[PDB]
Amino acid sequence: APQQINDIVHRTITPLIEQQKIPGMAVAVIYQGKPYYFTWGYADIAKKQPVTQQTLFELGSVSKTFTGVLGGDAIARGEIKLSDPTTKYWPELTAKQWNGITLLHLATYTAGGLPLQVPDEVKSSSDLLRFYQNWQPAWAPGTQRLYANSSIGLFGALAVKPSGLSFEQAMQTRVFQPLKLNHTWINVPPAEEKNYAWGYREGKAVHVSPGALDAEAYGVKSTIEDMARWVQSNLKPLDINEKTLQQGIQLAQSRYWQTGDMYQGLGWEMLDWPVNPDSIINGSDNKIALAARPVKAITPPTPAVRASWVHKTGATGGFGSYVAFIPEKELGIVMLANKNYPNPARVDAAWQILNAL
Amino acid sequence: APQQINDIVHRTITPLIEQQKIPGMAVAVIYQGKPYYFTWGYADIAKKQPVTQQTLFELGSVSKTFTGVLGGDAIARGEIKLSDPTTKYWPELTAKQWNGITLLHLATYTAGGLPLQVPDEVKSSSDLLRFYQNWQPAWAPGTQRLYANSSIGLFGALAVKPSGLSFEQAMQTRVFQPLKLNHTWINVPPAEEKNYAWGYREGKAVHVSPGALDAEAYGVKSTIEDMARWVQSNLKPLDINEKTLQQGIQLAQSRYWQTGDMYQGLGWEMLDWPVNPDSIINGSDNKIALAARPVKAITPPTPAVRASWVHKTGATGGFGSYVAFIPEKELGIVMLANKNYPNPARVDAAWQILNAL
């Protein structure tokens, strides 16, 4: 680890952890293409287990970059089209509303108001179908962005339908595997239970709860080393072999919509680089991030731009994560914690390290 | 040349030739990746110069494919965006109508009615400026497809604006060169003069006349060997060294609009495969080909599909050409003639062969 890196790291993360009261944290820095790992604290507080590079953390919403790529793959494979209507994959989706609602809308929260979370009462696929059928939109599709699980989640489920595979089976075989994402799970196997960190909420050890469209919207668990690869991959997709995956990645970072200085990709989110840290930091605020905003459509879209600050935050009840990278500079970082803490906090920490280069 | 290539070729072309009365022709077939050339008659009748595979032909509208790839390149280069307004690149293009006219519109003949041809009285950049200032649309941008030189021609001129290069310089350096098209010209160098075929029209030997936007709309001259390479490339853009050329290519075969069973790409046209010969044969007729047609917007577009029938016809006063390939089959063909003869004749001929495999 080059000093300068170690430096900004200690400088930056130590206070974050102390301030936020974070139990365990793992950090990776991709500098000029190479990763540098940092670890601190506890995965299991009472069992005194440390956070190692093999520690699995709940990525929460970071899962969405996965789902977005997996769908970019499906596109690249010719199996689906963003331009297709939802009903084409869910025939029984008879409601009119569904009319002009495309895969694209689902994928980018522009469907006109689908809910952030899927009701906890919705258990069966059946429940699920009532749910979607009975939903009426507030806006015209493609007019306003409203971050929602029930949206990109549905997109996930459907995007794998042609493949004949289960969401998780496609993910595995289509992304993890090819990428050597050996310790990435939707479901964590017994073999890895020992490495599965505990989330902490109000001082209680906790694990993501089960719910509809979870795998798709927030079910991925990973290690920093994996997240590191995840980063390199996304940083330089041209280097991956699977042609479809390689294309998928690029599709996920293409710009489909604009809202302010942000661009909505598939799963991912981008801003031009050089960025204005404010925008990023403050924008991370759920008060902004979770809000309903009017979108500008990019017709036709702008393919993945090298000069962007690409990134994503995610949270579960006991975990908080963040990802970001500058494709043009071959630089990025990944931060995973067993505590859900203020986003803005995560992004600023991110901004210091990276800004220090 | 495997027999059943030579066969179907002789079987099909030889007659075509007799039938249309074509003075010289050159054909190439791409089979399983490899190319196979066929030659016939003369290039220079009077002089009795045989068509060779070093013989240059005016591709007319086939140029447009080059224009399209050059165009997708520039976008891969972050140099331009299809979603941007024309005025952005030609600021003096102030008239209202130009309003919501994007580069996309321009590249795809979807601007609302620009004329097929640029009046020949239009000589200066000035003349050119009046022309477009005074042009009044027949429809709203993005509603109708109307094949046009003045459309894609301007797309080509502007797309190179930011690179600072002349249209030709950019093409040479950006496209011809990296592909090794050593005998492809917009303007023919003296040393190539002796290999440059004459066109024949009404028993007259003729070469394309100069015109505004000619380079961009129909200015290239090429050989079959080169055209071959052109074909291969297009068949497997993923093999191109140049990242931006490589993307440009796949950008040029993305589906932006649909009209009938056809999809408008950049320069290129495509249909799914298996294709219906009728539709392709009959569509090739100018009565249809040059007719406005309502387009359906592909939102967002469909990235290049491998199972497609991709092609383009082209002509100048004394030459007729055609190209078609099936990326999924590693199959394609090129027909170059020193005479402009019925397109449907070209498409059928082409179909026969490709259909034979």
XYZ file of C-alpha atoms in Angstrom:
714
model
C 0.000 0.000 0.000
C 1.621 3.229 -1.059
C 1.974 5.597 1.945
C -0.119 8.467 0.516
C -2.980 6.032 0.403
C -2.534 4.689 3.807
C -2.434 8.244 4.874
C -5.575 9.585 3.524
C -7.090 6.507 4.622
C -6.214 6.706 8.293
C -6.860 10.343 8.343
C -10.237 9.968 6.874
C -11.809 6.738 8.090
C -10.682 6.725 11.593
C -12.688 9.740 12.633
C -15.682 8.533 10.567
C -15.777 5.363 12.398
C -15.311 6.970 15.777
C -18.036 9.600 15.049
C -20.532 7.270 13.549
C -19.918 4.587 16.104
C -19.428 1.993 13.289
C -18.542 -1.518 14.662
C -16.820 -2.916 11.564
C -15.700 -1.376 8.308
C -13.764 -2.474 5.298
C -12.330 -0.157 2.762
C -10.803 -0.620 -0.737
C -8.959 1.793 -2.826
C -8.496 1.238 -6.506
C -5.673 3.314 -7.550
C -4.436 3.250 -11.153
C -6.308 -0.066 -11.408
C -5.005 -1.770 -8.259
C -6.817 -2.442 -5.059
C -5.736 -1.598 -1.578
C -7.639 -2.967 1.293
C -8.302 -1.629 4.719
C -10.041 -3.219 7.612
C -11.118 -2.177 11.092
C -13.228 -3.310 13.894
C -15.689 -6.082 14.445
C -17.872 -8.323 12.273
C -19.182 -9.963 15.332
C -18.904 -7.828 18.325
C -19.674 -10.285 21.074
C -17.811 -13.144 19.385
C -14.906 -10.705 18.995
C -14.575 -11.512 15.361
C -12.689 -8.995 13.364
C -13.521 -7.582 10.048
C -11.254 -9.301 7.449
C -11.205 -9.156 3.573
C -13.332 -12.213 3.637
C -16.042 -10.572 5.618
C -19.377 -10.491 3.958
C -21.462 -7.436 4.257
C -25.139 -6.774 3.216
C -24.817 -4.286 0.315
C -28.450 -3.231 0.552
C -29.199 -0.862 -2.432
C -25.717 -1.445 -3.915
C -27.233 -4.712 -5.113
C -28.849 -2.437 -7.790
C -25.684 -2.059 -9.807
C -25.735 -5.803 -9.995
C -29.273 -5.946 -11.142
C -28.652 -3.217 -13.555
C -25.717 -4.984 -15.138
C -27.453 -8.329 -15.217
C -30.178 -6.600 -17.272
C -27.607 -4.920 -19.470
C -26.336 -8.382 -20.100
C -29.886 -9.616 -20.938
C -30.096 -6.760 -23.421
C -26.697 -7.540 -24.799
C -27.813 -11.145 -25.109
C -30.894 -9.950 -27.286
C -33.209 -11.658 -24.768
C -35.051 -8.426 -23.692
C -35.349 -4.847 -24.825
C -35.577 -1.655 -22.647
C -38.047 -0.423 -25.113
C -40.399 -3.352 -24.451
C -43.578 -2.873 -22.420
C -43.854 -4.474 -19.114
C -46.760 -6.630 -20.077
C -44.690 -8.322 -22.629
C -42.999 -10.154 -19.773
C -45.895 -10.248 -17.443
C -48.856 -10.897 -19.606
C -51.242 -11.129 -16.629
C -50.395 -7.583 -15.980
C -53.644 -6.533 -17.451
C -54.230 -3.033 -15.804
C -54.342 -0.097 -18.399
C -52.037 1.910 -16.433
C -49.353 -0.539 -17.441
C -49.960 0.695 -20.854
C -46.887 2.548 -21.897
C -44.768 1.449 -18.933
C -41.528 0.038 -20.308
C -38.605 -2.036 -18.899
C -36.709 1.114 -19.050
C -39.159 2.946 -16.778
C -39.003 0.122 -14.287
C -35.244 0.018 -14.318
C -34.839 3.805 -13.801
C -37.660 4.691 -11.436
C -39.439 6.726 -14.166
C -42.521 4.699 -14.273
C -44.710 7.401 -12.727
C -44.604 6.680 -9.097
C -44.142 3.131 -8.100
C -43.472 2.791 -4.414
C -39.990 2.833 -2.789
C -40.700 -0.390 -0.885
C -43.078 -3.260 -1.691
C -45.763 -3.742 0.975
C -44.859 -6.181 3.618
C -48.299 -7.748 3.331
C -47.464 -8.772 -0.264
C -46.208 -12.313 0.227
C -47.148 -14.492 -2.842
C -46.540 -13.883 -6.516
C -50.219 -13.488 -6.406
C -50.142 -10.811 -3.817
C -47.550 -9.414 -6.052
C -49.731 -9.347 -9.111
C -52.617 -7.643 -7.172
C -50.145 -5.197 -6.005
C -48.907 -4.188 -9.390
C -52.363 -4.286 -11.014
C -53.989 -2.230 -8.375
C -51.229 0.474 -8.427
C -52.115 3.669 -10.022
C -49.553 6.145 -11.062
C -49.336 9.726 -10.275
C -47.365 10.696 -13.232
C -47.020 10.014 -16.998
C -44.365 7.468 -17.443
C -41.076 8.919 -18.231
C -41.764 12.263 -16.527
C -40.691 12.066 -12.966
C -38.067 9.974 -10.957
C -39.061 8.353 -7.698
C -36.477 5.941 -6.243
C -38.183 2.697 -5.564
C -37.454 -0.929 -4.884
C -40.834 -2.091 -6.298
C -39.635 -0.616 -9.527
C -36.127 -1.742 -10.212
C -37.101 -4.871 -8.311
C -39.773 -5.769 -10.826
C -37.411 -4.926 -13.588
C -35.012 -7.453 -12.155
C -37.504 -10.290 -11.950
C -38.722 -9.833 -15.442
C -35.414 -9.257 -17.039
C -34.407 -12.915 -16.333
C -37.693 -14.480 -17.593
C -36.581 -15.347 -21.115
C -33.333 -16.923 -19.826
C -35.497 -19.433 -18.063
C -33.273 -18.957 -15.069
C -34.095 -17.778 -11.572
C -33.013 -14.347 -10.691
C -30.253 -15.658 -8.424
C -29.199 -18.411 -10.818
C -28.744 -15.961 -13.591
C -26.863 -13.563 -11.398
C -24.478 -16.252 -10.309
C -23.853 -17.870 -13.624
C -24.134 -14.573 -15.534
C -22.136 -12.095 -13.350
C -20.561 -13.435 -10.287
C -19.074 -16.349 -11.895
C -17.587 -14.887 -14.942
C -16.191 -12.150 -12.751
C -14.757 -14.564 -10.199
C -17.069 -13.163 -7.702
C -16.538 -16.214 -5.529
C -17.783 -14.714 -2.346
C -20.775 -12.814 -3.571
C -24.138 -14.139 -2.541
C -27.824 -13.447 -2.776
C -28.288 -16.212 -0.434
C -25.409 -16.982 1.838
C -24.362 -20.469 2.012
C -23.504 -22.219 5.272
C -19.989 -22.393 4.243
C -19.818 -18.671 4.553
C -21.918 -18.193 7.616
C -18.825 -17.798 9.658
C -17.678 -14.891 7.516
C -21.156 -13.204 7.454
C -20.970 -10.065 9.491
C -23.606 -8.903 11.879
C -25.475 -5.667 11.157
C -26.049 -3.352 14.012
C -29.183 -1.406 14.718
C -29.688 0.389 17.992
C -27.091 -2.049 19.318
C -28.845 -5.130 18.166
C -27.076 -7.705 15.876
C -29.159 -7.873 12.801
C -29.546 -9.440 9.308
C -31.577 -8.244 6.353
C -35.197 -9.309 6.595
C -36.908 -11.259 3.898
C -39.489 -9.650 1.537
C -40.835 -9.486 -1.959
C -38.370 -8.683 -4.701
C -35.528 -8.624 -2.166
C -32.880 -10.457 -4.138
C -33.552 -8.100 -6.979
C -33.712 -4.839 -5.120
C -31.327 -5.447 -2.177
C -30.280 -9.018 -1.692
C -26.590 -9.062 -2.379
C -23.918 -9.764 0.204
C -20.189 -9.280 -0.615
C -16.599 -8.877 0.557
C -14.316 -6.015 -0.095
C -12.155 -8.039 -2.277
C -15.184 -8.917 -4.407
C -16.337 -5.370 -4.370
C -12.944 -4.414 -5.459
C -13.198 -6.673 -8.595
C -16.704 -5.268 -9.099
C -15.093 -1.940 -9.242
C -12.264 -2.795 -11.590
C -14.727 -4.479 -13.828
C -16.950 -1.439 -14.058
C -13.906 0.731 -14.379
C -12.810 -1.047 -17.404
C -15.315 -3.209 -18.861
C -13.451 -3.554 -22.186
C -11.167 -6.001 -20.449
C -13.817 -8.523 -19.523
C -14.290 -11.550 -21.784
C -17.907 -12.326 -21.732
C -19.003 -10.017 -24.612
C -22.510 -9.653 -23.267
C -21.301 -8.804 -19.678
C -18.837 -6.414 -21.053
C -21.670 -4.783 -22.967
C -24.049 -5.040 -20.145
C -21.653 -2.994 -17.956
C -21.438 -0.270 -20.499
C -25.188 -0.244 -20.844
C -25.620 0.214 -17.083
C -23.478 3.405 -17.066
C -25.157 4.942 -20.102
C -27.216 7.926 -19.426
C -30.957 7.566 -19.800
C -32.187 10.583 -17.855
C -31.065 13.707 -16.242
C -32.232 15.343 -13.026
C -30.142 18.214 -11.954
C -26.517 17.366 -12.408
C -27.146 13.697 -11.994
C -27.605 11.016 -14.687
C -29.622 7.943 -14.164
C -27.986 4.809 -15.482
C -29.109 1.178 -14.914
C -28.600 0.549 -11.161
C -25.629 3.025 -11.305
C -25.706 6.864 -11.143
C -23.369 9.378 -12.693
C -22.252 13.022 -12.686
C -19.665 14.557 -14.946
C -16.153 14.638 -13.699
C -14.713 16.846 -12.290
C -17.477 16.916 -9.776
C -18.701 19.347 -7.298
C -18.412 17.557 -4.043
C -21.312 19.549 -2.639
C -23.745 18.315 -5.132
C -22.565 14.851 -4.470
C -22.512 15.080 -0.724
C -25.637 16.917 -0.197
C -27.355 15.001 -3.008
C -26.711 11.814 -0.991
C -29.180 13.066 1.467
C -32.114 10.789 1.541
C -34.087 13.952 1.755
C -33.031 14.490 -1.795
C -32.164 11.054 -3.054
C -35.526 9.506 -2.036
C -37.604 12.514 -3.398
C -39.817 12.786 -6.564
C -38.041 14.762 -9.215
C -38.794 15.749 -12.725
C -36.573 14.165 -15.352
C -35.170 15.167 -18.643
C -35.054 12.399 -21.126
C -31.845 11.680 -23.034
C -32.946 10.866 -26.514
C -31.235 8.967 -27.523
C -29.125 8.074 -24.467
C -25.487 8.890 -23.896
C -23.314 5.888 -23.788
C -21.026 5.395 -20.854
C -18.728 8.463 -20.469
C -15.229 7.877 -19.146
C -15.213 11.279 -17.455
C -17.770 10.586 -14.793
C -18.053 10.168 -11.179
C -20.031 6.887 -10.953
C -21.354 5.645 -7.745
C -24.017 4.241 -5.457
C -25.035 3.966 -1.762
C -26.897 1.293 -0.141
C -28.323 0.432 3.205
C -30.039 -2.298 5.112
C -31.217 -2.068 8.740
C -27.851 -2.873 10.144
C -25.468 -1.943 7.260
C -24.347 0.954 5.154
C -22.371 0.958 1.947
C -21.028 3.104 -0.679
C -19.329 2.808 -4.048
C -17.675 5.191 -6.360
C -15.200 5.470 -9.104
C -13.699 7.646 -11.838
C -13.345 5.581 -14.855
C -11.154 8.142 -16.463
C -8.680 8.153 -13.659
C -8.683 4.473 -12.931
C -9.655 5.364 -9.425
C -12.442 4.328 -7.081
C -13.201 3.178 -3.669
C -15.618 0.866 -1.810
C -16.774 1.203 1.776
C -18.699 -1.334 3.722
C -19.977 -1.168 7.238
C -22.050 -3.112 9.657
C -23.941 -0.113 10.493
C -26.287 2.101 8.561
C -24.942 5.733 8.865
C -25.507 8.967 7.183
C -24.948 8.798 3.494
C -23.568 12.212 3.243
C -20.949 11.052 5.727
C -20.049 8.206 3.433
C -19.846 10.313 0.384
C -17.682 12.955 1.978
C -15.186 10.432 3.272
C -15.232 9.049 -0.251
C -14.606 12.488 -1.666
C -11.588 13.161 0.478
C -9.704 9.992 -0.332
C -10.448 10.162 -3.934
C -9.900 13.788 -4.153
C -6.491 13.198 -2.574
C -6.055 10.607 -5.342
C -13.191 -20.401 -53.262
C -15.316 -23.312 -52.127
C -17.373 -24.593 -55.078
C -20.803 -23.805 -53.776
C -19.796 -20.257 -53.584
C -18.428 -20.077 -56.985
C -21.586 -21.865 -58.066
C -24.294 -19.725 -56.578
C -22.239 -16.775 -57.561
C -21.948 -17.659 -61.231
C -25.411 -19.014 -61.262
C -26.807 -15.707 -59.943
C -24.556 -12.887 -61.071
C -23.593 -13.913 -64.507
C -27.187 -13.577 -65.533
C -27.731 -10.481 -63.595
C -25.034 -9.025 -65.578
C -26.340 -10.125 -68.922
C -29.742 -8.996 -67.897
C -28.921 -5.470 -66.789
C -26.243 -4.998 -69.298
C -23.548 -4.094 -66.627
C -20.107 -3.294 -68.113
C -17.934 -4.382 -65.150
C -18.785 -5.818 -61.743
C -17.049 -7.100 -58.735
C -18.426 -9.279 -56.099
C -17.337 -10.452 -52.708
C -18.718 -13.059 -50.531
C -17.981 -13.425 -46.960
C -18.291 -16.889 -45.803
C -17.707 -18.105 -42.345
C -15.518 -15.027 -41.965
C -13.453 -15.379 -45.085
C -13.804 -13.372 -48.254
C -14.233 -14.524 -51.843
C -13.967 -12.218 -54.802
C -15.504 -12.345 -58.107
C -14.798 -10.148 -61.077
C -16.230 -9.621 -64.542
C -16.010 -7.421 -67.613
C -14.560 -4.007 -67.842
C -14.005 -0.901 -65.927
C -12.926 1.051 -68.970
C -14.651 -0.229 -72.080
C -12.883 1.869 -74.670
C -9.590 1.030 -73.116
C -10.695 -2.504 -72.510
C -9.704 -2.389 -68.877
C -10.814 -5.298 -66.892
C -12.295 -4.986 -63.553
C -9.803 -6.156 -60.994
C -9.998 -6.346 -57.254
C -8.009 -3.220 -57.234
C -10.600 -1.518 -59.288
C -12.259 1.525 -57.664
C -15.971 2.038 -57.737
C -18.153 4.989 -56.800
C -20.198 3.569 -53.898
C -22.786 6.477 -53.996
C -25.191 6.126 -50.941
C -23.247 3.200 -49.648
C -20.859 5.968 -48.386
C -23.581 6.594 -45.869
C -22.492 3.659 -43.953
C -19.153 5.160 -43.554
C -20.734 8.385 -42.584
C -22.770 6.437 -39.925
C -19.761 4.637 -38.364
C -17.649 7.828 -38.475
C -20.634 9.340 -36.691
C -20.962 6.655 -34.004
C -17.194 7.058 -33.535
C -17.333 10.696 -32.631
C -19.989 9.793 -30.101
C -17.813 7.024 -28.669
C -15.161 9.789 -28.428
C -17.364 11.881 -26.240
C -17.019 14.404 -28.969
C -20.824 14.656 -29.856
C -24.202 13.432 -28.614
C -27.271 12.331 -30.790
C -29.638 13.898 -28.271
C -28.075 17.410 -28.938
C -29.585 20.150 -31.100
C -28.323 20.943 -34.548
C -27.707 24.598 -33.676
C -25.198 23.549 -31.061
C -22.865 22.577 -33.928
C -24.011 25.183 -36.402
C -24.859 28.132 -34.289
C -25.705 30.315 -37.274
C -28.550 27.889 -37.820
C -30.900 30.208 -36.002
C -34.321 29.801 -37.772
C -37.135 28.498 -35.419
C -37.883 25.299 -37.211
C -34.464 24.008 -36.206
C -35.715 23.987 -32.774
C -36.024 20.556 -31.555
C -34.048 19.105 -34.448
C -31.341 16.825 -32.953
C -28.301 15.184 -34.562
C -30.216 12.023 -34.270
C -32.977 13.424 -36.492
C -30.309 14.417 -39.001
C -28.519 11.092 -39.031
C -31.822 9.180 -39.408
C -33.813 11.195 -41.994
C -36.387 11.870 -39.186
C -36.210 15.628 -39.082
C -39.590 16.286 -40.534
C -38.786 16.399 -44.307
C -35.403 17.618 -45.374
C -35.107 17.145 -49.128
C -33.495 13.969 -50.671
C -31.151 16.131 -52.587
C -29.442 19.483 -51.905
C -30.244 21.861 -54.763
C -27.274 22.099 -57.139
C -27.429 25.921 -57.138
C -26.359 25.594 -53.520
C -22.496 26.177 -53.818
C -21.070 28.210 -50.787
C -21.345 27.408 -46.985
C -23.440 30.482 -47.270
C -25.654 29.061 -49.917
C -25.799 26.123 -47.782
C -26.736 28.217 -44.766
C -29.718 29.965 -46.634
C -30.889 26.678 -47.777
C -31.355 25.146 -44.480
C -32.569 28.478 -42.894
C -35.406 28.738 -45.283
C -36.310 25.048 -45.230
C -39.783 24.376 -43.776
C -40.678 21.062 -42.347
C -43.539 18.870 -43.503
C -43.855 17.091 -40.189
C -42.720 17.332 -36.621
C -39.194 16.011 -35.897
C -39.247 12.321 -34.927
C -42.599 11.531 -36.721
C -41.682 10.460 -40.303
C -38.742 8.813 -42.045
C -37.855 10.513 -45.350
C -34.650 9.224 -46.966
C -32.375 12.309 -47.697
C -28.845 13.409 -48.509
C -29.354 16.878 -47.185
C -30.243 15.223 -43.898
C -27.548 12.637 -43.129
C -25.215 14.792 -45.268
C -25.408 17.636 -42.770
C -25.219 15.070 -39.943
C -21.907 14.028 -41.320
C -20.576 17.572 -41.721
C -21.359 18.634 -38.186
C -20.437 15.433 -36.407
C -16.783 16.214 -37.241
C -16.983 19.818 -36.103
C -15.595 19.435 -32.665
C -12.641 17.221 -33.758
C -11.642 20.183 -35.758
C -10.866 17.858 -38.782
C -12.198 18.104 -42.322
C -14.788 15.470 -43.013
C -12.376 13.555 -45.249
C -9.457 13.850 -42.863
C -11.503 12.420 -40.148
C -12.788 9.543 -42.270
C -9.339 8.680 -43.517
C -7.766 8.774 -40.184
C -10.591 7.498 -38.180
C -12.069 4.859 -40.317
C -10.258 3.972 -43.510
C -6.940 3.809 -41.860
C -7.482 1.829 -38.757
C -9.270 -0.697 -40.954
C -6.583 -0.786 -43.433
C -8.752 0.280 -46.266
C -5.741 1.187 -48.433
C -7.657 1.882 -51.527
C -10.671 3.787 -50.321
C -11.048 7.447 -51.298
C -13.352 10.466 -51.164
C -11.065 12.185 -53.424
C -9.067 10.004 -55.750
C -5.363 10.395 -55.753
C -3.684 10.521 -59.170
C -1.942 7.226 -58.494
C -5.304 5.695 -58.063
C -6.591 7.305 -61.217
C -5.672 4.364 -63.395
C -7.687 1.956 -61.091
C -10.721 4.183 -60.953
C -13.601 2.771 -62.973
C -15.822 4.841 -65.222
C -19.491 4.791 -64.705
C -21.821 4.233 -67.537
C -25.003 5.965 -68.113
C -26.748 5.988 -71.510
C -23.639 4.592 -72.986
C -21.602 7.392 -71.583
C -18.623 7.081 -69.370
C -19.199 9.187 -66.283
C -17.866 9.931 -62.799
C -19.940 11.397 -59.974
C -20.384 15.205 -60.111
C -19.281 17.453 -57.353
C -21.948 18.686 -54.970
C -22.516 20.227 -51.614
C -22.301 17.608 -48.965
C -21.164 15.109 -51.467
C -18.444 13.712 -49.425
C -20.774 13.086 -46.558
C -23.760 11.780 -48.518
C -22.214 9.879 -51.437
C -18.532 10.659 -51.810
C -16.664 7.451 -51.320
C -14.988 5.279 -53.946
C -13.721 1.830 -53.030
C -12.514 -1.632 -54.070
C -14.029 -4.929 -53.369
C -11.161 -6.025 -51.285
C -11.602 -2.968 -49.195
C -15.289 -3.415 -49.191
C -14.677 -6.801 -47.981
C -12.740 -5.658 -45.020
C -15.570 -3.114 -44.494
C -17.890 -6.037 -44.371
C -15.847 -8.163 -41.998
C -15.367 -5.360 -39.701
C -19.027 -4.701 -39.596
C -19.599 -8.336 -39.058
C -17.437 -8.419 -36.016
C -16.819 -5.025 -34.669
C -15.671 -6.636 -31.351
C -12.428 -7.530 -33.089
C -11.530 -3.978 -33.947
C -8.523 -2.665 -32.180
C -9.793 0.914 -31.984
C -12.181 1.161 -29.054
C -14.153 4.114 -30.414
C -14.305 2.682 -33.991
C -15.338 -0.571 -32.400
C -18.224 1.197 -30.491
C -19.008 3.501 -33.403
C -19.663 0.403 -35.388
C -22.060 -1.126 -32.928
C -23.594 2.365 -32.556
C -24.259 2.462 -36.340
C -26.234 -0.877 -36.140
C -28.324 0.095 -33.194
C -32.059 0.414 -33.861
C -33.306 3.960 -33.429
C -36.622 3.776 -35.265
C -38.860 1.246 -36.791
C -40.944 1.513 -39.861
C -42.570 -1.552 -41.056
C -40.338 -4.576 -40.641
C -37.357 -2.391 -40.951
C -35.193 -0.455 -38.339
C -33.169 2.735 -39.091
C -29.562 2.586 -37.832
C -26.862 5.203 -38.478
C -26.265 4.896 -42.198
C -26.988 1.199 -41.956
C -30.527 -0.461 -42.260
C -31.539 -3.627 -40.650
C -34.299 -6.179 -40.319
C -34.474 -9.195 -38.092
C -33.241 -12.472 -39.485
C -34.597 -14.579 -40.805
C -35.646 -11.952 -43.153
C -38.662 -12.074 -45.675
C -37.133 -11.685 -49.141
C -40.180 -10.057 -50.490
C -40.138 -7.261 -48.002
C -36.480 -6.713 -48.617
C -36.755 -7.035 -52.376
C -39.743 -4.867 -52.767
C -38.701 -2.381 -50.121
C -35.527 -1.714 -52.200
C -37.606 -0.083 -54.737
C -37.271 3.635 -54.784
C -40.962 3.992 -54.865
C -40.847 2.744 -51.347
C -37.307 3.425 -50.320
C -37.574 7.143 -51.136
C -41.175 7.544 -49.751
C -41.910 9.129 -46.386
C -42.954 6.589 -43.857
C -44.164 7.023 -40.225
C -41.463 5.803 -37.875
C -41.917 4.361 -34.447
C -39.515 5.476 -31.855
C -37.316 2.915 -30.164
C -37.101 4.206 -26.661
C -34.481 3.702 -25.782
C -32.829 2.223 -28.899
C -31.911 -1.319 -29.417
C -28.181 -2.027 -29.505
C -27.035 -3.968 -32.466
C -28.681 -7.308 -32.818
C -26.604 -10.205 -34.137
C -29.577 -11.969 -35.724
C -30.151 -9.232 -38.312
C -30.119 -8.689 -41.932
C -28.102 -5.577 -42.297
C -27.628 -3.716 -45.469
C -27.535 -0.688 -47.747
C -27.851 0.042 -51.506
C -26.253 2.838 -53.238
C -25.934 4.549 -56.589
C -24.405 7.459 -58.426
C -25.232 8.310 -62.020
C -22.994 5.641 -63.641
C -22.721 3.081 -60.785
C -24.894 0.750 -58.732
C -23.890 -0.936 -55.396
C -25.137 -3.045 -52.624
C -24.029 -4.551 -49.290
C -25.690 -6.920 -46.926
C -24.508 -9.167 -44.100
C -25.754 -11.452 -41.419
C -23.650 -10.953 -38.427
C -25.031 -13.977 -36.813
C -24.014 -16.222 -39.651
C -20.641 -14.739 -40.303
C -22.186 -14.276 -43.738
C -22.318 -11.208 -46.032
C -21.833 -9.879 -49.523
C -20.929 -6.849 -51.610
C -21.808 -6.035 -55.189
C -20.176 -3.372 -57.049
C -21.155 -2.349 -60.560
C -20.185 0.248 -63.062
C -23.720 0.873 -63.744
C -26.736 1.887 -61.825
C -29.359 -0.791 -62.204
C -32.554 -1.722 -60.346
C -32.185 -2.225 -56.646
C -34.613 -4.961 -56.434
C -32.323 -6.732 -58.857
C -29.440 -6.254 -56.505
C -31.365 -7.341 -53.433
C -32.698 -10.453 -55.003
C -29.356 -11.477 -56.428
C -27.915 -10.910 -53.005
C -30.611 -12.876 -51.288
C -30.287 -15.855 -53.526
C -26.606 -16.117 -52.708
C -26.838 -15.456 -49.023
C -29.870 -17.595 -48.794
C -27.823 -20.359 -50.302
C -24.978 -20.003 -47.681
